[PDB]
Amino acid sequence: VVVISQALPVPTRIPGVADLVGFGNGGVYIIRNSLLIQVVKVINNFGYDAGGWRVEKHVRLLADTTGDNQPDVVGFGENGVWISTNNGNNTFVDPPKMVLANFAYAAGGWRVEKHIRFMADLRKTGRADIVGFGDGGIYISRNNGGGQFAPAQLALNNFGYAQGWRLDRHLRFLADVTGDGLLDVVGFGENQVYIARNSGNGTFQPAQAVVNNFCIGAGGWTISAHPRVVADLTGDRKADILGFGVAGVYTSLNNGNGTFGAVNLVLKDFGVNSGWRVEKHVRCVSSLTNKKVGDIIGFGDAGVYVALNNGNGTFGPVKRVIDNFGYNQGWRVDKHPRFVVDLTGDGCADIVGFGENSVWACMNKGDGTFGPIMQLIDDMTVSKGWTLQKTVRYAANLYL
Ligand SMILES: CC(=O)N[C@H]1[C@H](O[C@@H]2[C@@H](O)[C@H](O)O[C@H](CO)[C@@H]2O)O[C@H](CO)[C@@H](O)[C@@H]1O
Ligand SMILES: CC(=O)N[C@H]1[C@H](O[C@@H]2[C@@H](O)[C@H](O)O[C@H](CO)[C@@H]2O)O[C@H](CO)[C@@H](O)[C@@H]1O
Ligand SMILES: CC(=O)N[C@H]1[C@H](O[C@@H]2[C@@H](O)[C@H](O)O[C@H](CO)[C@@H]2O)O[C@H](CO)[C@@H](O)[C@@H]1O
Ligand SMILES: CC(=O)N[C@H]1[C@H](O[C@@H]2[C@@H](O)[C@H](O)O[C@H](CO)[C@@H]2O)O[C@H](CO)[C@@H](O)[C@@H]1O
Ligand SMILES: CC(=O)N[C@H]1[C@H](O[C@@H]2[C@@H](O)[C@H](O)O[C@H](CO)[C@@H]2O)O[C@H](CO)[C@@H](O)[C@@H]1O
Ligand SMILES: CC(=O)N[C@@H]1[C@@H](O)[C@H](O)[C@@H](CO)O[C@@H]1O
Ligand SMILES: [Ca+2]
Ligand SMILES: [Ca+2]
Ligand SMILES: [Ca+2]
């Protein structure tokens, strides 16, 4: 089940044994999930010093652009889109190749502060197309294989800067809301959540308002205080809506056809009223049990809090599953990336954090409870010069 969000543009597999990837000063480095835990440099590019890559101008992702289920390195650079393909053996093509003179800072006028760039398999080809929410609307470049990307085309004249879409007010996602397996657009706009149905052919149907909530102008949902996710809360592979609001967690369940039901307060925690603050805490939805549905995970003050989904979008009690990864243990949103991702292959998401001095993990027992914290390795951390301003780090399934 693939959902692409602004916060998590690189989806991960359930089950999986996700790797760690880092775009450091000197290039691209990986920690292969395996019996030997080490940092390996794979490309002398896509780095602050290796190619002049900047977080304020360029976009760096992992995505399968060839169709072999081994994600490639994709960077939206200064004058075009650059790709280093995955060789399958802990190496990548170096140097990367320039596949399209668009979607770039000085080619097409793309801006981190104004626009969104994703890679997604929008036509079920098995290959990721380039997808951008730009000025005029959503632009796609078809991945025709073999490094051949077609000229960018307007997929739909909406969800663009020109239609009032703003990173400081609104949210945009790609997610299948119909069940046909095609990722549709989900946008939390000014006054409505809208969807736009993927027609399969590089176009989206007109925006349709589905929910008059979860937006700044409909309920007072703000970017700085009230995060929102799109995720399957029921198990039918159709995405639902979840928001962390003031009183707690609100949901709107998919009716099954890309229309959405009533908005309900389903849990009185993980909200502003329980102390949660975007500036100090991390809130995620991931599958932590064999039910294969969105459970709630929060990196709070004292540790990690979890509420398990009963299977139908209603939730059990909140339990502090570990007394670590929290604000009280030194964890800072502007320094220490945290992800909820299967690292062990059992289908139950685990925890990994890039800490001050070590990368730390903590493994799901298989039932949504967790074991003790493990120090994985002393690298890819603040202490080794990895900052949010100069580097990008992800959990990603590089080998499949
Ligand atoms: C960030 C980026 O795109 N780096 C690639 C580099 O891009 C340079 C631009 O940074 C510079 O402004 O202009 C030239 C065109 O004159 C390039 O497009 O190009 C490198 C290859 O020369 C590539 O390795 C970098 O990844
Ligand atoms: C950002 C956004 O939601 N854009 C949509 C646009 O939204 C406008 C608001 O920007 C404006 O503040 O108020 C009006 C209603 O009074 C709309 O909600 O509306 C468009 C028309 O539906 C839509 O296509 C844009 O995406
Ligand atoms: C962002 C959010 O939680 N919106 C929901 C709305 O929340 C308001 C608060 O914005 C305000 O601070 O406090 C009051 C209670 O006195 C509410 O909790 O509540 C709406 C339901 O009443 C809900 O639809 C909004 O999404
Ligand atoms: C943000 C957060 O962690 N909220 C949980 C709440 O945490 C509070 C702390 O915010 C505060 O600093 O101290 C008290 C204890 O002195 C709690 O740790 O704790 C709640 C109950 O455990 C939990 O429901 C909140 O989600
Ligand atoms: C944020 C983080 O890495 N927390 C772990 C903690 O790391 C600390 C740093 O917060 C501190 O600034 O430096 C010291 C060394 O003096 C540690 O590296 O270490 C804790 C246990 O060793 C761990 O539980 C925190 O998660
Ligand atoms: C930010 C943005 O949408 N840029 C697009 C660009 O990619 C596209 O090729 C061009 C075509 O007219 O128009 C805009 O300039
Ligand atoms: Ca669909
Ligand atoms: Ca569902
Ligand atoms: Ca696991």
Residue numbers in the entry: 2 to 401
What is the paper's account of this structure, in its own sentences?
A new GlcNAc-specific lectin (PVL) was purified from the fruiting bodies and mycelium of a fungus, Psathyrella velutina and then structurally characterized. The PVL structure presents a novel fold among lectins, with seven β-sheets arranged in a β-propeller fold. The lectin therefore adopts a donut shape with six GlcNAc binding sites, and is expected to present strong avidity for cell surfaces presenting high density of terminal GlcNAc residues.
GlcNAc is also present in the branches of these glycoconjugates, either β1-2-linked to mannose (Man) on the trimannose core or β1-3-linked to galactose (Gal) as part of polylactosamine extended branches. Similarly glycosphingolipids contain GlcNAcβ1–3 or β1–6 linked to Gal but not in exposed terminal positions. The occurrence of aberrant βGlcNAc-terminating epitopes has been observed in a limited number of cancers, including human leukemia cells. The aim of the present work was to produce a recombinant form of PVL and to characterize its fine specificity towards the different GlcNAc-terminated epitopes that could be present on pathology-related truncated forms of human glycoconjugates. The avidity of the lectin for GlcNAc-decorated surface was evaluated on arrays. Finally, the ability of the lectin to label cancer cells and carcinoma tissues was also described.
